[PDB]
Design a protein around this ligand. Structure first.
Ligand SMILES: *Cc1ccc(-c2cnc([C@@](*)(O)CCCCCCc3ccccc3)o2)nc1
Ligand SMILES: *Cc1ccc(-c2cnc([C@@](*)(O)CCCCCCc3ccccc3)o2)nc1
Ligand SMILES: [Cl-]
Lengths: 544, 545
């Protein structure tokens, strides 16, 4: 009773193999025509310089394309981050608009970004052999700006997870240590970019899916305000859930790259292709500002106890910001627990899981999802009874469980109203301390494989800003030291529930892995957030 | 068990009388200190010139304030459009920021725009004696730009209606003919501005509530894209309904005024007070463009048969645009009936009316609501049975009724998704014909009092753009002729149901009343819409430019 699923996995395994084979052939042929091309010099250029050399004509597009293509092919051996080669892109190379802001840049794409003639499976058998009739809007805009989307990258099954495995393409691994998750759901992009095989990628984020893989794999990522960029044409799994919106944004090796991507996407082409997006140009002057900042900060969210590395990262960044002349102010958004347990959970699962679950009918469940699916299928009443049982022991479990029940349209209105007033509440705190930006810990170091779907509470640092729909980005600032890692033996967590226990074991054995912080600004202030991210980058990682 | 409602109406009647008295006193005292002030010269200035003279210091703020105040007090006699005098505002006059874009402009405000120390009752007894503890965001921005909000204006009970009566302040009347509705729910503003007693006002719109009273009272109004301006601090009655969004926007006697209001509100002060609003400045160059336009048009929406005046208005505007060198293209959004009956109705009433109905516990129901409330209180199952009965006879009635039922969050998701795809479908048609803007009929002439709440189908022209969330404005272009009015005897409507029958009678006896058209652009293109509206104004009514 699983024939479709097995068939799907087989076809998908075939298409992946054949893609990688095609890539290999093209790269090998290119290398024999061009033996005297310093490939490693090219691959290490910062994107901004790559772009400039592509504009001047000092580097051909073919040279940049096929060098990255080889590099991608190579890093994929140890990572399994590539699902498909976007076959028609050698043709796109030659047609690439010449004064485009990203002329000749190979760009990687999370699998959900629809591409003409390719599946966006999301690891789900339901969506195998259903190729896309057209490119999604942001892909078109990337093309119109001269970029060359060249690969689809892997995602955890359904994309609802901060790990990166599915039953079609299997398991993506962290390029810093193969026992570790690369993060998710944009984990493919994090593994690729973070092992040096794509200079620029796009991902999506509803609970942290740009920020986890960026932080875990040691790269920069930005999740904008939800309707700053076009979601039109993106492949999804739940339709019409507007309480917690989905956002999309760039991942790259430096902050300047993320700014360039935004500057390039926020142009007339996007605004006329999706008029539902407000036509807010990129404000150069705000991104380049060097005025002192008033910076809110917290060391812990009092929900997910941070690892010693997180905490050291946060504090060091804080101190260096202080020394560079910024004012640092303790700030914690009010009622985090209710924002996570009631608003975030209730909005993502207002219908009890029913619509989401449809995507899994007849399909296997990748074990990286843990018991999420099992739990969602439970009758409403039993979720309630179970919630009453656990409440005195493990109230956090009891709260997530109870707020995953189905409900009426009337209660969804009340919930949407609460989401709105919570948003206004935090804006008011922020204005009362007169903050410009906010600095927070970011989950890290990378967790062991198959642990993120058993440490749901650890989304606390990131999901808060999906609920608030504030822009939020991450910047790698240090690496785990032997000291940091030994200290994990003293980690206990605030709740002592299964999610605290898993997280403790999961963040262990992590010496050498990157750790980040998170930078947040108010709605529609992507440019300021990037400015602050740019500053954190200069102060903690000067050599670049 | 009606005592609180009667008490409420009595207190509210008192506060309204006392407000009007205070206004009268101040105006009379001002006139005697300043006998040599040409008042009528001042009242007829176009806003733009008013403003310029206020900036140069050729006219003092006191002079402009008190003159409008007297005019408001006077027109209110025949219209009952003013509920409260915003008593604070003589002290606001002297504090008014000098380089503000609206320095010294008196501005009228629909009752729901919260003002510190005044009730926003919405005609509902539940909200009487509950004064607002702060100004709403747009009122603060108006103040920071030097404007002087001076009155609250009347609304129909709950604000959910295109008529303008309630049990607290009573019934607002059209200043062109007192047997007629002024429109609503921003009817107060329409009656006040339209009788020359406020140069600039703000209203709100969820099914047409800026565009009805603007068209019915002969003034310009614009309903922006829903999140172009801040709704923060506005007084409502339903919370969390996001499928069909509420919008707010200006009403004034010319298009230029509406542009100035937007230019003034879309400023740092608004963007920092409500960061949820995208900080899209007013694009002067787009509003001032004089490039030819590609203009979609339709003459009827095939749902609400237009009155002969509507139809003449639409066609004349079309022809004049054609002669001015614009291209006119036939365009009708797809599936209007489903947009109104399923998406619009379902999104406004996804919970069956229950949240809305709460606002009416223990309160009288203004007869200008008709049977809306009675119908909403009906058990879900009886709404269904009734819907199945009427379907073969009067399918339109059957559809509105069935889509007012409660439902789960799962079905609301599906509805929200359909709303989203509907929005994209119409964008795609628009792009396939390569339109810049769209010209449509607008409901008119004004209906008889207590008829709008029995002609629900007639919101078809306006509500379509609340569902799509496109900017949409109205510009008066002509007046009902005796020929137009006689033709109403030939009006049948497309359905022949009770809504068609009521509408026929209700638009009769309307000679001399203004009629408008509607101008629509894509989301976030308020400036282009205003450019088009400016063009329609120029061509049909050259004198206001
Ligand atoms: C169809 C679909 C499904 C998921 C996503 C999506 C896009 N981006 C992301 C990531 O941010 C998800 C991180 C995991 C969040 C898990 C949070 C959670 C809350 C409550 C209970 C369990 C888990 O996912 N796009 C489209
Ligand atoms: C609490 C509240 C209630 C109403 C409003 C509001 C703002 N603007 C408007 C007007 O657009 C109302 C126009 C009339 C719409 C009636 C439409 C209707 C559809 C389906 C069935 C019956 C009637 O109202 N703001 C706040
Ligand atoms: Cl928006």
């Amino acid at each position: 009773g699983r024939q479709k699923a097995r068939g799907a996995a087989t076809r998908a395994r075939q298409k992946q193999r054949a893609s990688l084979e095609t890539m290999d052939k093209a790269v090998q042929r290119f290398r024999l025509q061009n033996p005297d091309l310093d490939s490693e010099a090219l691959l290490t250029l910062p994107l901004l310089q790559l772009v400039q050399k592509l504009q001047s004509g000092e580097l051909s597009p073919e040279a940049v394309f096929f060098t990255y293509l080889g590099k991608a092919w190579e890093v994929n051996k140890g990572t399994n981050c590539v699902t498909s080669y976007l076959t028609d892109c050698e043709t796109q190379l030659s047609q690439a608009p010449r004064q485009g802001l990203l002329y000749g840049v190979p760009v990687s794409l999370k699998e959900c970004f629809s591409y003409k003639g390719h599946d966006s499976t999301l690891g789900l058998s339901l969506n195998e052999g259903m190729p896309s009739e057209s490119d999604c809007v942001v892909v078109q805009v990337l093309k119109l700006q001269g970029a060359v989307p060249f690969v689809h990258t892997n995602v955890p099954q359904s994309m609802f997870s901060y790990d990166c495995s599915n039953p079609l393409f299997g398991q993506t691994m962290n390029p810093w240590k193969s026992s570790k998750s690369p993060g998710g759901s944009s984990g493919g992009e994090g593994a690729l970019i973070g092992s040096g095989g794509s200079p620029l990628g796009l991902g999506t984020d509803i609970g942290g899916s740009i920020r986890f893989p960026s932080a875990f794999c040691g790269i920069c990522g930005l999740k904008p305000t939800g309707n700053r960029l076009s979601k039109s044409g993106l492949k999804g799994c739940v339709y019409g859930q507007t309480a917690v919106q989905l956002s999309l944004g760039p991942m790259a090796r430096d902050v300047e790259s993320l700014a360039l991507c935004l500057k390039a996407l926020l142009c007339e082409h996007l605004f006329t292709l999706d008029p539902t997006v407000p036509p807010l140009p990129f404000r150069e002057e705000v991104y380049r500002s060097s005025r002192p900042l008033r910076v809110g900060y917290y060391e812990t969210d009092n929900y997910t106890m941070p690892s010693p590395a997180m905490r050291r990262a946060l504090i060091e960044t804080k101190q260096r910001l202080e020394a560079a002349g910024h004012t640092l102010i303790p700030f914690l958004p009010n009622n985090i627990p209710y924002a996570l347990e009631v608003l975030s959970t209730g909005g993502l699962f207002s219908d009890g899981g029913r619509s989401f679950l449809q995507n899994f009918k007849g399909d296997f469940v990748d074990p990286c999802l843990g018991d999420l699916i099992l739990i969602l299928r439970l009758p409403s009443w039993f979720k309630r009874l179970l919630s009453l049982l656990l409440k005195p022991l493990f109230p956090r479990l009891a709260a997530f469980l109870n707020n995953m029940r189905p409900r009426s349209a009337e209660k969804l209105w009340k919930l949407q109203h609460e989401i709105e007033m919570y948003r206004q509440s935090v804006i008011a705190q922020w204005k009362a301390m007169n903050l410009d930006v906010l600095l927070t810990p970011m989950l890290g170091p990378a967790l062991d494989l198959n642990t993120p779907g058993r440490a749901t509470g650890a989304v606390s640092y990131t999901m808060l800003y999906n609920c608030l729909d504030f822009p939020a980005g991450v910047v790698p600032v240090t690496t785990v030291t032997a000291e940091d890692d030994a200290q994990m033996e003293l980690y206990k967590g605030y709740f002592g529930d299964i999610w605290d226990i898993i997280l403790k074991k999961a963040m262990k054995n992590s010496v050498g892995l990157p750790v980040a912080v998170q930078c947040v600004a108010l709605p529609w202030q992507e440019e300021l957030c990037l400015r602050f991210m740019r500053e954190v980058e200069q102060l903690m990682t000067p050599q670049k």
